[PDB]
Design a protein around this nucleic acid. Structure first.
Ligand code: NA
Ligand code: NA
Ligand code: NA
Length: 326
DNA sequence: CCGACAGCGCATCAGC
DNA sequence: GCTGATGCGCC
DNA sequence: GTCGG
């Protein structure tokens, strides 16, 4: 429900996760805090003690104990000193720039660099990806309105076809799940001339999308995966639409739907499916669905021509993309 | 008590 | 020059 | 940090 119920607690947890991830470089601690913060979100009751929250999956002794200290004092000793930390705050912030992870953030903060302004003055100490992340700092933190997504979709699809009518292109993520807003645009690309058996295939797409002035920057590009920046055309005299993150993967036709399924998520939904496929005699990854032997041994890939085949194999009513949150 | 917690493509760097 | 390590993003 | 073996 609404934040107020356990916002103070979930906020603390989230703040702690960011600290562990950006500062401590302890990714598993980050996830442990995040998982607990989200499970405490679902909870329909005002948590009155740590022991209460402990009754949940993902909440152990340490978090239960911080919840006890939080309820009593309204603060968190640890988070307090962390907010004072002249370094922890700065390292946390810099990682908000795409291309700057825990390592670079720390190096910058040690060289005295700790604000966007500092970054602008020292563009020379940043690689190409980081320069772009700095350039579109604000634009990258904005949500993309579904209405805008559709508009972008029509552009990609249209252009993809303009190059070769046999190109299959699907847009996934929260978009393909119907959501009103999306963080970025993920596009899965395939072509009949590309399978797990058989360079200008992905390239001529990125190339074309550059010609119609959609894709504006490249973070990374190779023969199978592309990550860059796109933008919708300006409606005369009106604000130029913000720049957006676009990913374009070239997946083999024989593992395209497993791809399509995996990248449509949500990840929590996939887990409730991966773990279900596991106790029914099947394994689902990003590329293929495979049959297991008695001794947990895998086996050759099984023919998948549609996102539906995956469900039939593990006997699970084809869930709808519209209601596949979990 | 103790290990796993996902694993991969691209960019870039270290060691040679 | 190359090969392997590493940092980064990301269901 | 939490869970499972
Ligand atoms: Na618990
Ligand atoms: Na970042
Ligand atoms: Na995505």
């Amino acid at each position: 429900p609404q934040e107020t119920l356990n916002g103070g607690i979930t906020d603390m947890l989230t703040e702690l996760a960011n600290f562990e991830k950006n500062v401590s470089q302890a990714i598993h601690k980050y996830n442990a805090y995040r998982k607990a913060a989200s499970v405490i979100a679902k909870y329909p009751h005002k948590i009155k003690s740590g022991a209460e929250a402990k009754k949940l999956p993902g909440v152990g002794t340490k978090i239960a104990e911080k919840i006890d200290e939080f309820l009593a004092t309204g603060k968190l000793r640890k988070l307090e000193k962390i907010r004072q930390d002249d370094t922890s705050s700065s390292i946390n912030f810099l990682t908000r720039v795409s291309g700057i992870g825990p390592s670079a953030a720390r190096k910058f903060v040690d060289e005295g660099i700790k604000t966007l302004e500092d970054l602008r003055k020292n563009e020379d100490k940043l690689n190409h990806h980081q320069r772009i992340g700095l350039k579109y700092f604000g634009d990258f933190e904005k949500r993309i309105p579904r209405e805008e997504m559709l508009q972008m979709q029509d552009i990609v699809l249209n252009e993809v076809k303009k190059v070769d009518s046999e190109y299959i292109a699907t847009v996934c993520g929260s978009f393909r799940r119907g959501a009103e807003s999306s963080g970025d645009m993920d596009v899965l690309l395939t072509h009949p001339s590309f399978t797990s058996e058989s360079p200008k295939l992905l390239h001529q797409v990125v190339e074309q999308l550059q010609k119609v002035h959609f894709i504006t920057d490249t973070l990374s590009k190779g023969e199978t995966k592309f990550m860059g920046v796109c933008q919708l055309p300006s409606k005369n005299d009106e604000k130029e639409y913000p720049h957006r993150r676009i990913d374009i993967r070239l997946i083999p036709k024989d593992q395209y739907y497993c791809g399509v399924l995996y990248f449509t998520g949500s990840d929590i939904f996939n887990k409730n499916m991966r773990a279900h496929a596991l106790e029914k005699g099947f394994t689902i990854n990003e590329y293929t669905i495979r049959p297991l032997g008695v001794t947990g041994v895998a086996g050759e890939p099984l023919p998948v021509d549609s996102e539906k085949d995956i469900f039939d194999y593990i006997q699970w009513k084809y869930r709808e993309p519209k209601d596949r949150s979990e």
